[PDB]
Amino acid sequence: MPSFDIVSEVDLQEARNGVDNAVREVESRFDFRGVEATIELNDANKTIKVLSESDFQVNQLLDILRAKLLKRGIEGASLDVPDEFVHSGKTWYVEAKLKQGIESAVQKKIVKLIKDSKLKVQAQIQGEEIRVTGKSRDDLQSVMALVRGGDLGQPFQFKNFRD
Numbered sequence: 794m795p796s797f798d799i800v801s802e803v804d805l806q807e808a809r810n811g812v813d814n815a816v817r818e819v820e821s822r823f824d825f826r827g828v829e830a831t832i833e834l835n836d837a838n839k840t841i842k843v844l845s846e847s848d849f850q851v852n853q854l855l856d857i858l859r860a861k862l863l864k865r866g867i868e869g870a871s872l873d874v875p876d877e878f879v880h881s882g883k884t885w886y887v888e889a890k891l892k893q894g895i896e897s898a899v900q901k902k903i904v905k906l907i908k909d910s911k912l913k914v915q916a917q918i919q920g921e922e923i924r925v926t927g928k929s930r931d932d933l934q935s936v937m938a939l940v941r942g943g944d945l946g947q948p949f950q951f952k953n954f955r956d
C-alpha cells in the first residue's frame with residue numbers, strides 16, 4: 794500500500810534570520826536613514842508586517858526581505874503578499890503571510906483536484922499536510938506532477954514515501 798505526503802515547509806528560524814538580516818540591511822541603507830522603515834515577524838500568525846512612508850518604499854523593503862529570504866532557503870513564492878497595501882495616516886504597510894503548512898482552504902483544492910483526475914488514489918487531510926495513498930506507484934507519481942504543475946499559489950515538496 795504505497796503512500797507519500799504533500800507538505801509545504803519553511804524553517805521558521807531561517808525566516809526570522811532573514812528578517813533579522815533584512816533589518817540590518819535597511820539600517821545600512823542611507824536612503825532609509827531617518828526614515829520610518831520596519832520589518833516585524835509575528836511568529837504566532839506566520840506574518841511579516843513591512844511598513845514605511847510610501848508605497849514605493851514598502852516594495853523596496855519587500856524586495857530586500859525577499860533577497861534575504863532566498864539566501865536563507867526561503868523562496869519568494871512562500872511569501873504571500875496581499876493585493877492591497879494599507880494607507881493609514883502618513884504610513885504605508887502590508888501584512889505578508891509566510892506560507893508554512895497547507896492551509897485548510899488549499900488542502901480542499903488539492904483533494905478536489907486529485908478527485909477530478911480520476912486516478913485510483915485516496916487523499917486524506919492530516920494535520921498540516923495531505924497523505925496520498927494508492928496501489929500504483931505510477932499513479933502516485935502522476936498526482937505529484939499534477940500538484941507540481943498546479944497554480945495552487947505555493948511551493949510543495951513531497952516527503953515520507955512509504956511502502
Ligand SMILES: Nc1nc2c(ncn2[C@@H]2O[C@@H]3COP(=O)(O)O[C@H]4[C@@H](O)[C@H](n5cnc6c(=O)[nH]c(N)nc65)O[C@@H]4COP(=O)(O)O[C@H]3[C@H]2O)c(=O)[nH]1
Pocket residue numbers: 823825826827828
Ligand atoms: N536622512 C537624514 N537623516 C537625518 C538628518 N538629520 C538628522 N537626521 C536623523 O536624525 C538622527 C540624529 O541627527 P543628529 O541629532 O544631528 O545626530 C547625528 C549628528 O550629530 C551626526 N551626523 C550624522 N550625519 C551627519 C552629517 O552629515 N553632518 C553633521 N554635522 N553631523 C552628522 O551624528 C548623529 C547621529 O546620526 P544618525 O545616526 O544618522 O541619526 C540622525 C539621522 O537619522 C538629515 O539631514 N538626513
